[PDB]
Specification:
3 chains, about 140 residues, mainly alpha, about 0% strand, globular, binds adenosine-5'-triphosphate, binds adenosine-5'-diphosphate, Cytoplasmic dynein 1 heavy chain 1 (chain A), motor protein, dynein-1, Cytoplasmic dynein 1 heavy chain 1
Chain lengths: ~140, ~1500, ~270
C-alpha cells in the first residue's frame, strides 16, 4: 500500500486524519490556519519525490511533524485568543508559527543550511497576514 | 525500601547494601553522595558526626544549611537523607533570593564598585551568581518592555544595555589581575553569561520590540523570580517560548559554562519545545559539535544534573538498567552519547526500555514497569539521545530531532577570549578558528593529532594564562624599576597576537612531527602575518641540562648542533610539565623518551633544590586488579593497588615526600581498560576514585607521565585529558648513540686495568664510529637488506655494543692469562679492528639468511679499509678473529668426534659443526653480559638443543624450560619464580634470587612469540619480560612493592614471525634482545654430522663398516632434492628438516640393532624403506611419488653402483616384525595371509565389518604399526572419509594391545567435557601403565582451544592445566600407587610428576584423522604447530583403481555374473591397469 | 568459466584505457613557500599512488585470469566486487557519487589522471608562476575545497593580507574573452542548474543545466558593505547527488526577478 501521489490527495489525507472538532474551534481563523498548514505540509512532502532538486536529501517529513505543527498552532492560537469568537488576522502570532516551524518542527531534520533557507522561504511566503486576503496566491504561474 | 526517598534509588545494589550496613558510619556514605548528587562530593558535619551542617563540592566550594539536619533525631537512613535534600533545596532558594536582592542593588546603576561586586561574587556560588545575573537581567528587560507598552515612547532599555556594558567592562578589568582559581571560574562564567545578555539585548534593540508579549522576546530564555510564592522551590520559574520549567534547585557545584551561540539557542528552543510537548529530543550530528554539552548546559541552567552514558561497544545493561530506573525515580535528566555505537541487541533492548518510559511520560501529561518493578517517573523526567550519522523505528515517533551540523567555533573563540581578558577578541577569534581549520586540513594526518573544538578551548585557556603571567612579570619588573603601576596601562601596551601565537607554539609544536613544523610556521605567517614568536630559552635550565647530560654520558646541544633537537624536546617536556599535571610522551622506540624525562628530573633537582623520586610502573605487566586495588567479594577487605599504594605513601608525607617532586612514569603501552580509572585523575579534579569509594587527593608535586611508543589504541578522552610531546625517531641520531656507547665504555668498567683496556679500545674504534663512518654506512646498508625479524636501529647497535664489551673482556682475559707479556698496542689495534668487523657482520646480519650475510660481507669488504681475508669465495663470517688479532677459519675450531653406538640420534648428543660452533660463540658472548636473546629459526634446525648444549656447557647457570602457549599469562612466570626462587629482605629492598646460591637461573621459553596478543596489540608475558629486563626488577602483586631481580636472566627461542600461528614481537621488546637466526644445517654440516652418526651406528656390524661414508653421502644427497622439490608452497605439510634426517638414522639403527650380520643389499633395502617411510608418505599426487621412487633409484645406484638392483630394491619394500622375531623384510603374500588371519580373529572378537585386503591396506597397516611401536607415537591420518583411516587405526591398536579411545562429541560437548575426557585418558595411561590409542577426528573438534590443549600435550607429553587442586592431589595419589606397584619409591611431587610424564610419553598414543583439505591443512598447521612439528602424517588419499577393482571382485563374489554367452569385443574400454587379457563377464562387470 | 573470460576481457580493456604513470612534482624551497605548489604536489602524490595501486590490482587480476596467480583474500574480494559491478572499497579513496558503477568510476579516474598529468607537465615546464595560471576543473580534483583554500592562501601571501579578511568573487566569462588578473584563478567544469549566466547575471530558465564556460575565482579585501538585494548565494555541490558542499558563490540576478524564486527552484552550481 502506497500513498497516492498528488497535492490534492495529500491534502485530502491530511484533512481526513485531523479530527473534525479540532479544526472547528472557537476562533474561526483556526480553520484557515489549518488549511495553510495542510497546504504547506503537502508542498513540503511532495518536493521529496524530486530528491536532488526539491531538497538535498530524502528527509523524513512524516505525519509526526504535522501533528506537532498542528499542536503548536492550537497552543499559540489559544494563548493569543483567550476564548474569543473572532481574532483579527494581524493579531495572529505569525512570527511564533514561522519560527517554531523553521527551528523546532520541520527544522530538526534539516541539516544543510540551504534546505533551511528554502524552508524559511516557504514559511515566510505562506504564513503571513497577507494570506488572509481573498487575493492570496498559494502558488504562482503554475501554467 | 527504595520506594520511599526515590533519590537514592539512583545507586545500585552494592551501594544500597553498603549504606544499609554502614548507616551509622556516615563518614562512609560520601561515596553514595558522590554518585547521586551533581557536584556534592561530601557533606559537611561537626566533630560529633551527628548533625549535617552543609554540603561541599569537589572543587571546595561549600554550602552551609540555614537549619542543619541532625541525624540523631532521624536515625533512619532515608528520613535524614530526605531531610538533607529538602534542606539543600531550601538553602539554595534562600541564597538565590539574597543574591537576587544584592544584584538588584547592583543593577540599575551607572557605575559599580569592583570591591563590593567581587565580594558579592565570593559570597555565593558560581551557580548562584549566574542565576542572580540572569534573573536581574530578565526582570530589567521585562520592566523596560512593559514601559515600552505605550509604543512610540522613549526607550530606557538603552539604559539596560548600558548597564550590561559597564558591568562587562568591570569584569574585563577584574580578570586581568591575579585571582583565586575558584573566583576565576566564577568570573569566567559570569562574563560568558553577560556577553550573551549583551548580544541578545542588542538584538532586541535592533528589532525595536515594544511589547513584552512579542515573540522575539518570548523566544529568549526568561527567568522569573517570585519571592511572594510560599514554596521556595517554585519561587524561580524558567520560561522560554511557550514552555515553562520550574527550577530544580539542585546543587550542581561548579560546571564548565557553555557559550550560547545561535546554534546553542536553537538547541535550547528545540529541546524545550520537545519537553513541553512531553517527548525527548535527539540532537543528531557528527562528533565534537556540542551534542552532549548542550544537553548538559540545558540541564544545569534548569538546575538538573545529567548522567551522560558512554555508549561504547563494551556497554553494561544491568548497571545501566539500575542507573536509568534511578534517573526515572529521581526525575533528573539522562543523556545517551553516541547511541548508534551499541550492539544491535543492546540497541533494541535499550530502545524498548526508553520507549516504555517515554510512553509512560506522555501518559503522565504514575508508574511504569521497569526491571520487573514499579517505578514512579517524575513529570520533570527527560531523555536525550545523541546520535552520529538513524533513530530506532520504535522511537522515531516519540523523539524530536535536531541537527548539530556545525558549532559556532568563531563565536565560541570570541567569547572565551573576551572572558580571559583579551582585548580585540573578535580579530583573534576570526584569526584562530580558520587557523585550526587549516591545521586540520592541510597538515598531514597523524594518529596523535587533534584539532577539534576541545583543542581550541585548551589553546585559548593556555593563552589566557600566558597573558596573565606576562602581566605579572611586567608588574614585578615595574615594581623593581620605578613604582608607577597601572594594570590598564600594562594591558593596553601588551601585544596580543604574539601571546596567542606563543600559546599555540607551546601547546601544538610539541605534538608535531619533524616535517609538519615548517608547514605550521607557514600557516601562522599566513593567518597572523608580520608577527612572530621566538621562545626565550631557559638559560638557567640549559646549564643544568648540560651538567646532567655530562654526568650521565649523554650528548647535549643547542639548536642546530648535534643533539639540539633532543634538548629542545626536553625543554618542551618541561613546559608541558609546568602547565599540566599528567603527561604522555609519544615516540617510536629509540627516541630518548626515558632519558629525556630522567635527565629533566635530575636537572630540576639540581636547579630548584627539590630532589625528585621516580616510580616507574608497568601497567600491562601487572594485573589491573592488583594495580588499582582489590576489594574482596565476601570479606569486603580493601588492599591498595600499587599505584594507589604509592599515591597513599606520597600523600602520607612520612619522610617529606610532599616537599619532593615525584614522577610516576607509566612506562608501557596504554589501552582503554585501566586508564579509564585514571581518567578521573588526569582531569582538573585530580583525584583517584577507587572501587571502594575512597579517594586520595593528588598532590601538586606528583606528575603522572605515560611514556608510550604509539597512540593507535588509546581513546580520544585520554588523549585530550593530558599533554603530549612527540619524540620523532630523528630526535637522537646515530651519532648520539655512538657517543653514549663510547663514553659509557670509557667511564664505567665492565666488571682499573680493564678500564684502561676499554679506553684504548674506544680510542681504536673512534675513527670507525664517527659520522658517515664504517658503522653508519653499514647500518644504512643493513637496513636495505631483509631480516627474519623487524629491524630496529637500537637492536643492532645494542648487539654491536654487547659484542664489543665481550671483545674487551676477551682482551682482559688474554692479559690476565699472559702476565709476562701484556698485549701490545699494535696487536690490540689489529684484534680490535678485526673483531669490530666480525661484530658488524654478526650483529647487523645476525638475523638473516646466508645470502644476505654474504651480500653484507661483500659490501663491507668494498667500503672498509681494514685488512680482510683473501679467501676467493669463503665469506668472512666463516672466519673468526683469533685472540692474536688474525683471521682464522672457523673450520679449524670444529673437531671430529666419534659418537657411541648406543647414543645415535639420542636427544642429548650434539655433534659440533660450523653453525654449532659459531652459535656457541654468540651465545657465550650474549650470556656473559646476561642480555636476553631470542633464537629465531625454522622448526627443527636444533634451536632448542643448541641452546641447551651451550647452557649445560656453562657450569654456573641453571636452566628452567617454560613451554609458552597461546594462552600464556605472566602467572606462569610467577609460579616458576616461587618454585625455584625465594624473596629475601635486604636494606636496598626485597630481592628475588634463586634458592640455590651462586646460580644464574635461566628461563628458557620454548616459543617466545607464541603467546597471543590482546585486542590492543599487547602480549602480557612479552610486556612482563620487557619490564624485568629493562627495569631490573618487577612488582610483587601480593604486597605491591618493588622486587629486584638478582641472578635471574631470560633466554628465548621462536619460529619465524612469518610462520602462521606466531605474532611479531613488539619493537620495544626487540630493542633489548638480540636475535640470532639458526638456519637449517648446510650440505657440509649434515654430511659431517650424519657421517658421525653412521660411523657410530655401523659399529654393530663390522663387515659393512666401510660403507658408512657412501651411505651418509647418499642420505644427504637424496634429502637435498627432497627438500628442493616439495617446497612448502605446493602443500603446507611439505616441510623438510634435519629432524627427518635424524629420524632416518634412528630408524636404520633400530632396524640394524637386533640383526647380527647383514650384506650391503640388506642395508640399501633398509635405507630405501626408511626413505619411503619418511619422504614419500607425505606426498599427495601420484606423479610426486613416482618422482620419489625414480630419484631414490638414481641415488642408490649413484652411491652404491656395485650392487644388484633386483634384490636390494625389489619393488614390494615391506618390513614387519609380526611373522619373524626381528624387523626383517616381509613378503607381501605371507604378510597378506597373516593379516587376513588376524582380521578373521578381529571379526570374531571385535566389530564384524568386512575389510578386503588390497596392498594399500597392507602398506598403511604396517606404517601405523611402526608408528605405534615407536615411543610417543602420534599420527596425523589424512584422507577422504571412508578410506579406512579409523578402521585401520583400530585394527592396529587391537593387534598391538592398545585400547582404542574416542570421545563421544555432541553439540553440547563443551571444552570442560573435553578436558574431563583428556584427564580420564591421562589417568588411564600413566597411572595404569596401559597404552592408549587416542582417536581424534576434526569432526570431534568444535573449537581451536581443543587444538591448543592437544598441541601442549603433543609438545610436552603432558598439560599442567588439566590437573590442579584436588584433581592434582588425586593424580599424585594414583601415580604414587603406580610407582609402588611397579617397584619405584618416590615421595616428592616433582619426581612422581616426571615419572607420570615418562609413563604418558611412553604409553599414550594420539592419532588425528582428517579430510584432505589443502586450505584446511594450512589452517590447522597455522593453529597448532605440534600436528606438523613432530607428528608423522600419512596420505591415505582415495582408493586407487586397483583397490576399486579388488573391492568390486571380492564384494560381488556371492552373485553369479558368469555368462558363457559373453563375447570379447574388438575394443575393450579398460580402466583397470592389471585387467586380464581375456576379460571374463565378472571381470568386465567389476571393470 | 565464461565469467572469468569476460572479466579478463574487461580488465584488459580497462588496463589499456587507464593511463600508465604519473610524475611527482620537484621539491624546491621557493616552491615549498608557494601554497598552490603544496596542494598540487599533495594531489599528484595521492593520484599517482592510487593509480599505481589500481594498475597493480588490475595486473594481478589479469595474472589470476591467466591462472599464473592464485586468489588471495584481497584479490578474491576485489574479483567479487568487479563481477557484481560494485565499486571496490580499496579503490574509492576520494568522494564518489553513491550510485556510480565501476565503469563510470574508471572513466572518471582516467579523466582525473589525465588532468593530473597535464598539471604535472605544466609545473615541470615552468614553475609556481605558471602553476597559478592553470585552468583546473573542480570536479576532477580529489579535494576541490582544498584547491579553494590553496588559492585563498596564495592571494593572502601575494598581497601580504591575512586570511580571515579575504572574500570570494566569481566572474563567469568565456574562455577566450577572459582576463587573468593577479588574484584570478581559472576553473572549468562548473555547470549551473536552473539558470543561465550571461554577463555574470543570472536568469531563471527552463533548461535543466547550463554549462559555465570559465569560472574565475578572485579574492578581494572585505568591503564591509551589505550585499545588494539582487545578490543570491548559490551552493556549489561536487556531484549531482548534492551531498558535498564545496563553497558558496554570489551572483547578481537580473531585473524583475525574485531571489526567493531562485531559492524555490533549487538553483545550484555543480562541479560535475
Ligand atoms: N641525549 C642522548 N645522547 C646520546 N644517547 C642518548 C641520549 N638520550 C638517550 N640516549 C641513548 O639512546 C637510547 C634511548 O634510551 P631510552 O630508554 O630513553 O629510549 P626510548 O626511545 O625512550 O625507549 P622506549 O621507547 O623503549 O622506552 C639509550 O641507549 C640511551 O642511552
Ligand atoms: N557553545 C558550545 N557548543 C558546542 N560545543 C561547545 C560549546 N562550548 C564549549 N564547547 C566544547 O565542545 C566540546 C565537545 O563537545 P561534545 O559534547 O564532546 O560534542 P559531542 O556531543 O559531539 O561529543 C566540549 O569539550 C565543550 O567544552
Ligand atoms: N647441528 C645439529 N646437531 C645435532 N642435531 C641436530 C642438528 N641440526 C638438526 N638437528 C636435529 O634437530 C632436532 C632438534 O630440533 P628441535 O630442538 O626440536 O627444534 P625446535 O625446538 O625449533 O622445534 C634434533 O632431533 C636433531 O637430531
Ligand atoms: N580395506 C577395506 N575394505 C573394505 N572396506 C573398508 C576398508 N577400509 C575401510 N572400509 C570401510 O570403511 C568404513 C569405515 O570408514 P572409516 O575408516 O571410519 O572412515 P575414515 O577413514 O574417514 O575414518 C567401514 O564400514 C568399512 O566397511
Amino acid at each position: 500500500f502506497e500513498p497516492p501521489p498528488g497535492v490534492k490527495a495529500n491534502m485530502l489525507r491530511t484533512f481526513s486524519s485531523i479530527p473534525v472538532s479540532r479544526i472547528c474551534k472557537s476562533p474561526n481563523e483556526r480553520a484557515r490556519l489549518y488549511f495553510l498548514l495542510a497546504w504547506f505540509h503537502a508542498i513540503i512532502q511532495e518536493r521529496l519525490r524530486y530528491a536532488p532538486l526539491g531538497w538535498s536529501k530524502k528527509y523524513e517529513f512524516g505525519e509526526s511533524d504535522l501533528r506537532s505543527a498542528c499542536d503548536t498552532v492550537d497552543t499559540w492560537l489559544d494563548d493569543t485568543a483567550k476564548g474569543r469568537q473572532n481574532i483579527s488576522p494581524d493579531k495572529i502570532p505569525w512570527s511564533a508559527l514561522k519560527t517554531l516551524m523553521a527551528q523546532s518542527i520541520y527544522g530538526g531534520r534539516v541539516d544543510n543550511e540551504f534546505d533551511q533557507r528554502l524552508l524559511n522561504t516557504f514559511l515566510e511566503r505562506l504564513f503571513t497576514t497577507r494570506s488572509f486576503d481573498s487575493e492570496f496566491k498559494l502558488a504562482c504561474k503554475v501554467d | 525500601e527504595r520506594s520511599s526517598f526515590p533519590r537514592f534509588y539512583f545507586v545500585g545494589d552494592e551501594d544500597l547494601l553498603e549504606i544499609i550496613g554502614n548507616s551509622k558510619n556516615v563518614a562512609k556514605l560520601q561515596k553514595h553522595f558522590k554518585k547521586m548528587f551533581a557536584g556534592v562530593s561530601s557533606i559537611i558535619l561537626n566533630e560529633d558526626n551527628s548533625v549535617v551542617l552543609g554540603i561541599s563540592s569537589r572543587e571546595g566550594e561549600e554550602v552551609m544549611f540555614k537549619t542543619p539536619v541532625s541525624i540523631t533525631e532521624h536515625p533512619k537512613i532515608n528520613e535524614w537523607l530526605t531531610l538533607v535534600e529538602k534542606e539543600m533545596r531550601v538553602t539554595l532558594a534562600k541564597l538565590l533570593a539574597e543574591s537576587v536582592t544584592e544584584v538588584e542593588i547592583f543593577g540599575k546603576a551607572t557605575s559599580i564598585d569592583p570591591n563590593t561586586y567581587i565580594t558579592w561574587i565570593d559570597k555565593y556560588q558560581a551557580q548562584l551568581v549566574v542565576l542572580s545575573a540572569q534573573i536581574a537581567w530578565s526582570e530589567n528587560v521585562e520592566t523596560a518592555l512593559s514601559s515600552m507598552g505605550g509604543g512610540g515612547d522613549a526607550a530606557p532599555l538603552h539604559s539596560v544595555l548600558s548597564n550590561v556594558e559597564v558591568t562587562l567592562n568591570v569584569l574585563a578589568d577584574s580578570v586581568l589581575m591575579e585571582q583565586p582559581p575558584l573566583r576565576r571560574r566564577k568570573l569566567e562564567h559570569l562574563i560568558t553569561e553577560l556577553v550573551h545578555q549583551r548580544d541578545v539585548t542588542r538584538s532586541l534593540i535592533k528589532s525595536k520590540i515594544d511589547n513584552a508579549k512579542s515573540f522575539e522576546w518570548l523566544s529568549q530564555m526568561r527567568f522569573y523570580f517570585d519571592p511572594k510564592q510560599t514554596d521556595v522551590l517554585q519561587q524561580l520559574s524558567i520560561q522560554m517560548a511557550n514552555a515553562k520549567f520550574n527550577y530544580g534547585f539542585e546543587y550542581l557545584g561548579v560546571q564548565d559554562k557553555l557559550v550560547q551561540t545561535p546554534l546553542t539557542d536553537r538547541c535550547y528552543l528545540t529541546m524545550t519545545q520537545a519537553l513541553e510537548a512531553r517527548l525527548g529530543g535527539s540532537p543528531f550530528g557528527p562528533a565534537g559539535t556540542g551534542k552532549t554539552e548542550s544537553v548538559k548546559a540545558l540541564g544545569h541552567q534548569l538546575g538538573r544534573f545529567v548522567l551522560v552514558f558512554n555508549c561504547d561497544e563494551t556497554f553494561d545493561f544491568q548497571a545501566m538498567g539500575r542507573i536509568f530506573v534511578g534517573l526515572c525515580q529521581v526525575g533528573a535528566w539522562g543523556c545517551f552519547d553516541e547511541f548508534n555505537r551499541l550492539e544491535e541487541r543492546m540497541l533494541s533492548a535499550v530502545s524498548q526500555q526508553v520507549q516504555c518510559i517515554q510512553e509512560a511520560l506522555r501518559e503522565h501529561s504514575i508508574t511504569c514497569e521497569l526491571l520487573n518493578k514499579q517505578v514512579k517517573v517524575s513529570p520533570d523526567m527527560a531523555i536525550f539521545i545523541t546520535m552520529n550519522p538513524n533513530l530506532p523505528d520504535n522511537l522515531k515517533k516519540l523523539f524530536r530531532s535536531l541537527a548539530m551540523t556545525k558549532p559556532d567555533r568563531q563565536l565560541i573563540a570570541q567569547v572565551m577570549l573576551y572572558s580571559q581578558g583579551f582585548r580585540t577578541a573578535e580579530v583573534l577569534a576570526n584569526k584562530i578558528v580558520p587557523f585550526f581549520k587549516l591545521c586540520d586540513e592541510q597538515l598531514s594526518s597523524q594518529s596523535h593529532y587533534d584539532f577539534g573544538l576541545r583543542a581550541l578551548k585548551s589553546v585559548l585557556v593556555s593563552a589566557g594564562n600566558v597573558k596573565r603571567e606576562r602581566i605579572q612579570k611586567i608588574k614585578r619588573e615595574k615594581e623593581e624599576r620605578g613604582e608607577a603601576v597601572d594594570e590598564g596601562e600594562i594591558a593596553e601596551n601588551l601585544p596580543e597576537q604574539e601571546i596567542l601565537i606563543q600559546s599555540v607554539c607551546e601547546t601544538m609544536v610539541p605534538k608535531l612531527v619533524a616535517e609538519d613544523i615548517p608547514l605550521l610556521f607557514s600557516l601562522l605567517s599566513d593567518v597572523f602575518p608580520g608577527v612572530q614568536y621566538h621562545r626565550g630559552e631557559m638559560t638557567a635550565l640549559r646549564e643544568e641540562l648540560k651538567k646532567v647530560c655530562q654526568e650521565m654520558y649523554l650528548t647535549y646541544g643547542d639548536g642546530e648542533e648535534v643533539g639540539g633537537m633532543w634538548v629542545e624536546k626536553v625543554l618542551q617536556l618541561y613546559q608541558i610539565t609546568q602547565i599540566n599535571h599528567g603527561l604522555m610522551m609519544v615516540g617510536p622506540s629509540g627516541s630518548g623518551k626515558s632519558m629525556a624525562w630522567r635527565v629533566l628530573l635530575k636537572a630540576l633537582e639540581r636547579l630548584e633544590g627539590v630532589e625528585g623520586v621516580a616510580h616507574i610502573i608497568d601497567p600491562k605487566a601487572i594485573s589491573k586488579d592488583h594495580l588499582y586495588g582489590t576489594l574482596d567479594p565476601n570479606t569486603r577487605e580493601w588492599t591498595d593497588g600499587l599505584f594507589t599504594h604509592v599515591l597513599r605513601k606520597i600523600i602520607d608525607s612520612v619522610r617529606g615526600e610532599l616537599q619532593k617532586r615525584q614522577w610516576i612514569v607509566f612506562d608501557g603501552d596504554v589501552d582503554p581498560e585501566w586508564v579509564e580509572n585514571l581518567n578521573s585523575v588526569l582531569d582538573d579534579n585530580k583525584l583517584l576514585t577507587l572501587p571502594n569509594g575512597e579517594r586520595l587527593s593528588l598532590p601538586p608535586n606528583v606528575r603522572i607521565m605515560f611514556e608510550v611508543q604509539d597512540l593507535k589504541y588509546a581513546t580520544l578522552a585520554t588523549v585530550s585529558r593530558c599533554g603530549m610531546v612527540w619524540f620523532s625517531e630523528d630526535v637522537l641520531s646515530t651519532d648520539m648513540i655512538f657517543n653514549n656507547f663510547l663514553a659509557r665504555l670509557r667511564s664505567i668498567p665492565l666488571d682499573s686495568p680493564m678500564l684502561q683496556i676499554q679506553r684504548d679500545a674506544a680510542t681504536i674504534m673512534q675513527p670507525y664510529f664517527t659520522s658517515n663512518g664504517l658503522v653508519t654506512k653499514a647500518l644504512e646498508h643493513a637496513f636495505q637488506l631483509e631480516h627474519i625479524m623487524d629491524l630496529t636501529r637500537l637492536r643492532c647497535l645494542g648487539s654491536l655494543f654487547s659484542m664489543l664489551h665481550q671483545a674487551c673482556r676477551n682482551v682482559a682475559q688474554y692479559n690476565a692469562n699472559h702476565p709476562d707479556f701484556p698485549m701490545q698496542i699494535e696487536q690490540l689495534e689489529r684484534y680490535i679492528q678485526r673483531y669490530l668487523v666480525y661484530a658488524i657482520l654478526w650483529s647487523l646480519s645476525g638475523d638473516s639468511r646466508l645470502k644476505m650475510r654474504a651480500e653484507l660481507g661483500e659490501y663491507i669488504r668494498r667500503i672498509t679499509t681494514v685488512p680482510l681475508p683473501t679467501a676467493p669465495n669463503i665469506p668472512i663470517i666463516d672466519y673468526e678473529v683469533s685472540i692474536s688479532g688474525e683471521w682464522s677459519p672457523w673450520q679449524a675450531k670444529v673437531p671430529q668426534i666419534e659418537v657411541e653406538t648406543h647414543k645415535v640420534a639420542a636427544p642429548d648428543v650434539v655433534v659440533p659443526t660450523l653453525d654449532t660452533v659459531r652459535h656457541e660463540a654468540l651465545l657465550y658472548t650474549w650470556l656473559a653480559e646476561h642480555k636476553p636473546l631470542v633464537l629465531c629459526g625454522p622448526p627443527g634446525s636444533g634451536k632448542t638443543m643448541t641452546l641447551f648444549s651451550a647452557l649445560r656447557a656453562l657450569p654456573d647457570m641453571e636452566v628452567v624450560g617454560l613451554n609458552f602457549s597461546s594462552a600464556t599469562t605472566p602467572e606462569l612466570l610467577l609460579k616458576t619464580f616461587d618454585h625455584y626462587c625465594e624473596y629475601r629482605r635486604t636494606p636496598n629492598g626485597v630481592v628475588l634470587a634463586p634458592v640455590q646460591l651462586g646460580k644464574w637461573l635461566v628461563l628458557f621459553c620454548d616459543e617466545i612469540n607464541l603467546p597471543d596478543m590482546d585486542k590492543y596489540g599487547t602480549q602480557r608475558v612479552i610486556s612482563f619480560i620487557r619490564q624485568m629486563v629493562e627495569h631490573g626488577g618487577f612488582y610483587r602483586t601480593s604486597d605491591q612493592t618493588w622486587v629486584k631481580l638478582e641472578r635471574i636472566q631470560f633466554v628465548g627461542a621462536c619460529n619465524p614471525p612469518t610462520d602462521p600461528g606466531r605474532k611479531p614481537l613488539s619493537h620495544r621488546f626487540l630493542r633489548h634482545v638480540p636475535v640470532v637466526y639458526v638456519d637449517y644445517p648446510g650440505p657440509a654440516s649434515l654430511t659431517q654430522i650424519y657421517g658421525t652418526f653412521n660411523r657410530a651406528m655401523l659399529r654393530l656390524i663390522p663387515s659393512l663398516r666401510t660403507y658408512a661414508e657412501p651411505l651418509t653421502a647418499a642420505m644427504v644427497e637424496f634429502y637435498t632434492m627432497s627438500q628442493e622439490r616439495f617446497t612448502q608452497d605446493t602443500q603446507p605439510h611439505y616441510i623438510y628438516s634435519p629432524r627427518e634426517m635424524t629420524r632416518w638414522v634412528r630408524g636404520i639403527f633400530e632396524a640394524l640393532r637386533p640383526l647380527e650380520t647383514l650384506p650391503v643389499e640388506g642395508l640399501i633395502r633398509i635405507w630405501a624403506h626408511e626413505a619411503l617411510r619418511l619422504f614419500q608418505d607425505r606426498l599427495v599426487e601420484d606423479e610426486e611419488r613416482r618422482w620419489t621412487d625414480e630419484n631414490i633409484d638414481t641415488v642408490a645406484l649413484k652411491h652404491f653402483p656395485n650392487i644388484d638392483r633386483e634384490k636390494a630394491m625389489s619393488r614390494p619394500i615391506l618390513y614387519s616384525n609380526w611373522l619373524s622375531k626381528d624387523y626383517i623384510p616381509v613378503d607381501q603374500e605371507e604378510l597378506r595371509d597373516y593379516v587376513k588371519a588376524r582380521l578373521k580373529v578381529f571379526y570374531e572378537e571385535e566389530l564384524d565389518v568386512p575389510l578386503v585386503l588390497f596392498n594399500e591396506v597392507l602398506d598403511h597397516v604396517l606404517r601405523i604399526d611402526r608408528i605405534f611401536r615407536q615411543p610417543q607415537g602420534h599420527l596425523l591420518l589424512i584422507g577422504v572419509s571412508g578410506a579406512g583411516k579409523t578402521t585401520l587405526s583400530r585394527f592396529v591398536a587391537w593387534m598391538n594391545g592398545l585400547s582404542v579411545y574416542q570421545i563421544k562429541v555432541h553439540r553440547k560437548y563443551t571444552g570442560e567435557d573435553f578436558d574431563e575426557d583428556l584427564r580420564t585418558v591421562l589417568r588411564r595411561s600413566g597411572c595404569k601403565n596401559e597404552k592408549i590409542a587416542f582417536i581424534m577426528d576434526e569432526s570431534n573438534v568444535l573449537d581451536s582451544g581443543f587444538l591448543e590443549r592437544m598441541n601442549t600435550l603433543l609438545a610436552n607429553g603432558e598439560v599442567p592445566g588439566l590437573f590442579e587442586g584436588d584433581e592434582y592431589a588425586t593424580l599424585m595419589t594414583q601415580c604414587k600407587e603406580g610407582a609402588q606397584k611397579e617397584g619405584l619409591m618416590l615421595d616428592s611431587h616433582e619426581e612422581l610428576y616426571k615419572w607420570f610424564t615418562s609413563q604418558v610419553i611412553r604409553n599414550l598414543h594420539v592419532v588425528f584423522t582428517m579430510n584432505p583439505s589443502s586450505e584446511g591443512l594450512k589452517d590447522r598447521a597455522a593453529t597448532s604447530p605440534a600436528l606438523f612439528n613432530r607428528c608423522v602424517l600419512n596420505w591415505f588419499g582415495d582408493w586407487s583403481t586397483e583397490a576399486l577393482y579388488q573391492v568390486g571382485k571380492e564384494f560381488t563374489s556371492k552373485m553369479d555374473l558368469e555368462k558363457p554367452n559373453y563375447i570379447v569385443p574388438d575394443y575393450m574400454p579398460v580402466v583397470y591397469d592389471k585387467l586380464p587379457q581375456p576379460p571374463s563377464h565378472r571381470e568386465a562387470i567389476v571393470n | 568459466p565464461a565469467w572469468m573470460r569476460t572479466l579478463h576481457t574487461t580488465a584488459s580493456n580497462w588496463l589499456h584505457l587507464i593511463p600508465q604513470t604519473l610524475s611527482h612534482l620537484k621539491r624546491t624551497v621557493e616552491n615549498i613557500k608557494d601554497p598552490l605548489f603544496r596542494f598540487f604536489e599533495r594531489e599528484v602524490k595521492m593520484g599517482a599512488k592510487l593509480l599505481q595501486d589500481v594498475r597493480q590490482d588490475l595486473a594481478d587480476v589479469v595474472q589470476v585470469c591467466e591462472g599464473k596467480k592464485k586468489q588471495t583474500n584481497y584479490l578474491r574480494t576485489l574479483i567479487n566486487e568487479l563481477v557484481k559491478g560494485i565499486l571496490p572499497r580499496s579503490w574509492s579513496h576520494y568522494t564518489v557519487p553513491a550510485g556510480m558503477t565501476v565503469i563510470q568510476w574508471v572513466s572518471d579516474f582516467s579523466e582525473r589522471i589525465k588532468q593530473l598529468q597535464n598539471i604535472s607537465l605544466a609545473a615541470a615546464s615552468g614553475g609556481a608562476k605558471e602553476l597559478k595560471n592553470i585552468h583546473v576543473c573542480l570536479g576532477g580534483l580529489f579535494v576541490p575545497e582544498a584547491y579553494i583554500t590553496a588559492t585563498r592562501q596564495y592571494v593572502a601571501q601575494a598581497n601580504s593580507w591575512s586570511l580571515e579578511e579575504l572574500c570570494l568573487e566569481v566572474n563567469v566569462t568565456t574562455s577566450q574573452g577572459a582576463t587573468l588578473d593577479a588574484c584570478s584563478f581559472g576553473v572549468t567544469g562548473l555547470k549551473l542548474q536552473g539558470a543561465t549566466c550571461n554577463n555574470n547575471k543570472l536568469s531563471l530558465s527552463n533548461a535543466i543545466s547550463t554549462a559555465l564556460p570559465l569560472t574565475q575565482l578572485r579574492w578581494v579585501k572585505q568591503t564591509n558593505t551589505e550585499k545588494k538585494a539582487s545578490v543570491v548565494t548559490l551552493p556549489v555541490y561536487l556531484n549531482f547527488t548534492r551531498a558535498d558542499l564545496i563553497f558558496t558563490v554570489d551572483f547578481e540576478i537580473a531585473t524583475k526577478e525574485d531571489p526567493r524564486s531562485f531559492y524555490e527552484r533549487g538553483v545550484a552550481v555543480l562541479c560535475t
